Design a protein around this ligand. Structure first.
Ligand SMILES: [Mg+2]
Ligand SMILES: [Mg+2]
Ligand SMILES: [Mg+2]
Ligand SMILES: [Mg+2]
Ligand SMILES: [Mg+2]
Ligand SMILES: [Mg+2]
Ligand SMILES: [Mg+2]
Ligand SMILES: [Mg+2]
Ligand SMILES: [Mg+2]
Ligand SMILES: [Mg+2]
Ligand SMILES: [Mg+2]
Ligand SMILES: [Mg+2]
Ligand SMILES: [Mg+2]
Ligand SMILES: [Mg+2]
Ligand SMILES: [Mg+2]
Ligand SMILES: [Mg+2]
Ligand SMILES: [Mg+2]
Ligand SMILES: [Mg+2]
Ligand SMILES: [Mg+2]
Ligand SMILES: [Mg+2]
Ligand SMILES: [Mg+2]
Ligand SMILES: [Mg+2]
Ligand SMILES: [Mg+2]
Ligand SMILES: [Mg+2]
Ligand SMILES: [Mg+2]
Ligand SMILES: [Mg+2]
Ligand SMILES: [Mg+2]
Ligand SMILES: [Mg+2]
Ligand SMILES: [Mg+2]
Ligand SMILES: [Mg+2]
Ligand SMILES: [Mg+2]
Ligand SMILES: [Mg+2]
Ligand SMILES: [Mg+2]
Lengths: 133, 146, 94
RNA sequence: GGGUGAUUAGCUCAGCGAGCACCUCCCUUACAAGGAGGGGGCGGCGGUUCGAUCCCGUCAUCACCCACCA
RNA sequence: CGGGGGGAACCUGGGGAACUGAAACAUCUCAGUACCCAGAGGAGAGGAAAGAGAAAUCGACUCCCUGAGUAGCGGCGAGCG
RNA sequence: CUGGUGUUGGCUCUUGGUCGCGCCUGCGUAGGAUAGGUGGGAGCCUGUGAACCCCCGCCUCCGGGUGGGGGGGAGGCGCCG
RNA sequence: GGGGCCUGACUGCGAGGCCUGCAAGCCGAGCAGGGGCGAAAGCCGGGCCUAGUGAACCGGUGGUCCCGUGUGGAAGGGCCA
């Protein structure tokens, strides 16, 4: 890689599990990008994609504005916006969409579901965050 | 199983270290070869009681030296030698420097361990060093007559 | 004498019960006994030889109590006697 | 009631389309052996993707060692 | 200094059947009986709650009456309790 | 007869599982001839010796894939096609 | 024998009897609920009838919510199938 996140990886730690509100505020400072940062935080899920009965879909737009689908490998992705929103508001938006997921969580789906959510951007790292606290 | 090593045993470490090894090793090798003992309420007590004993004898030696260090780090001895001009007819041996210090200033010294090589054959001002373990510079003045 | 010289453990009588069938807890009709007969269980009895004062003292002990012999070994006061010195290291206080 | 294995054109197999066959054709002189061509054919559907005899629940039979049976 | 061996039955501990009953028989019964062994004594055992068990209760152990052929146990059989 | 385990220890080489993270990995003309999945995302990495180069390595679906080092020193460039 | 519409191959019961050592087996009008066919009277609690079957124990499975070992639950049982 470059020195983009080799300047930035000694301040942000993947090893020791973290929670949202303390690890939420660093998402715009962790991206050294030149342009237009669109943050994406994600976790994979414990449902077997090999059966379509357990899949999940929809379109639910976020309150704040532009600026959910599971794959066949069983992870989850979604855009939360554009550069736009600041660092301290996302404790409000970092628990926002994350509670729209579990709405359509399947019943015959087996296992702990939000597994490892790593707060990231298009431009950014692996850092542990709790889905809840 | 807890054993107190009686001898540095190399991977399973140093003397008096409390190491945990399998009972079979303990009972059929270490113990009967006098290589260790069971670490018990007693044998561990005797150990700690004797880690204190030594760390007293040592820490009262470093507080022995430095306690008679400052005596002769300040106090000075001057020894008149049968004159010559900046050459001594005799010398002053390390032995001699002892004898002086006893006679004037009343301290006692072994007297090995300053500089034994070259028993010093010239007049001048010298700074000589002492022992055991952290230690002293001393000041000897040599001049003339008796 | 298959009896631990330290703990006192000695052989006991136990029944051997042959059962057939499927536990009720598994939804079987439940288990049936096709035989019961007497057997024994011996203590797990081992030699431990240890050197004490002059001599070699060997105990017959249930492997559970093997440590007790070395505790008993520490216990060193004034015995110049024969290999029947063990009556002294046998137990004293306990 | 298990482990699950045997899943396959007409018969058997192999892949998370071949041999003994059958037909025309050579070779002998002839069974032959060979040598060359032709022949819907994959336990079962719903569903997966670009594609899927080459991805997943019912269960359709199949053995071997197995469970149990008032 | 003590032990050893004996003692009708009684006692505790170590071991421990079968006939029989189950109208056959194996789990079950008989039965922890008979018997063998060890050890107590004039008794032995037990005994001073890591107990009961539903009352905010009782209060060591032993023995009798009762609780009660109850609660249960049981090829839910015989029967055990 | 036999698995596990106790009695049962020292030193080694050797492997499987699985977990964590690091690391690579994969070809149905095509997009530009070498697309693992899928939503983002309109570029960027780059001098902390790029564009290539050479020796030296690893996997090789081999045109190709890929890192260590230096000869390396101011471009390659994403959608756009 | 043919056609149309249906599922009474009902649920809650059952006067009275046939048979009969017991246990069983058999027939059964009628009332209640909600239905089917019928304009209706009415019929319908399987089949023209008489064989097509198996006490109890133990256990499976669905259900009700009855019991739930100090109490709330739970384990397990009961009851209906
Ligand atoms: Mg057994
Ligand atoms: Mg039974
Ligand atoms: Mg018997
Ligand atoms: Mg031994
Ligand atoms: Mg043990
Ligand atoms: Mg004790
Ligand atoms: Mg007895
Ligand atoms: Mg009998
Ligand atoms: Mg008999
Ligand atoms: Mg009988
Ligand atoms: Mg009889
Ligand atoms: Mg008979
Ligand atoms: Mg009995
Ligand atoms: Mg007796
Ligand atoms: Mg007697
Ligand atoms: Mg009397
Ligand atoms: Mg009396
Ligand atoms: Mg008495
Ligand atoms: Mg009894
Ligand atoms: Mg490993
Ligand atoms: Mg009647
Ligand atoms: Mg009758
Ligand atoms: Mg009627
Ligand atoms: Mg009516
Ligand atoms: Mg009508
Ligand atoms: Mg009517
Ligand atoms: Mg019976
Ligand atoms: Mg029953
Ligand atoms: Mg209830
Ligand atoms: Mg309760
Ligand atoms: Mg209740
Ligand atoms: Mg209770
Ligand atoms: Mg129930």
């Amino acid at each position: 890689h470059g020195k983009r996140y080799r300047a930035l990886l000694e301040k942000v730690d993947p090893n020791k599990i973290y929670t949202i509100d303390e690890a939420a505020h660093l998402v715009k400072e962790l991206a050294t990008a030149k342009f237009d940062e669109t943050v994406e935080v994600h976790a994979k899920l414990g449902i077997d994609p090999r059966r379509s009965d357990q899949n999940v879909r929809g379109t639910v737009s976020l309150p704040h504005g532009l600026g959910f689908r599971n794959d066949k490998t069983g992870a989850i992705h979604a855009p939360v916006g554009k550069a736009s929103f600041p660092p301290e508001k996302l404790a409000d938006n970092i628990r926002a969409f994350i509670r729209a997921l579990e709405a359509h969580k399947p019943e015959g789906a087996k296992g702990t579901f939000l597994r490892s959510v790593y707060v990231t951007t298009t431009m950014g790292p692996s850092v542990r965050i709790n889905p809840h606290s | 199983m807890k054993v107190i090593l009686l001898e540095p045993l190399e991977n399973l470490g140093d003397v008096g270290q409390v190491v945990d090894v399998k009972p079979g090793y303990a009972r059929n090798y270490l113990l009967p070869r006098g290589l260790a003992v069971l670490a018990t309420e007693s044998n561990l007590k005797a150990l700690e009681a004797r880690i204190r004993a030594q760390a007293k004898r040592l820490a009262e030696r470093k507080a022995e030296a430095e306690r008679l260090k400052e005596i002769l780090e300040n106090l000075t001895l001057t020894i008149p030698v049968r004159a010559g001009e900046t050459k001594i007819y005799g010398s002053v041996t390390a032995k001699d420097i002892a004898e002086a210090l006893s006679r004037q200033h009343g301290v006692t010294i072994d007297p090995k361990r300053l500089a034994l090589e070259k028993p010093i054959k010239e007049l001048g001002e010298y700074v000589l060093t002492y022992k055991p373990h952290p230690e002293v510079p001393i000041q000897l003045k040599v001049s003339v007559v008796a | 004498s298959k009896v631990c010289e330290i703990s006192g453990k000695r052989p006991i009588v136990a029944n051997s019960i042959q059962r057939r069938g499927k536990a009720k807890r598994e939804g079987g009709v439940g288990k049936k006994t096709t035989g019961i007969s007497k057997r024994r269980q011996y203590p797990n009895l081992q030699k431990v030889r240890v050197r004490v004062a002059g001599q070699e003292i060997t105990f017959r002990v249930a492997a559970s109590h093997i440590p007790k012999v070395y505790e008993l070994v520490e216990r060193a006061k004034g015995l110049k006697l024969e290999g029947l010195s063990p009556k002294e290291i046998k137990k004293e206080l306990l």
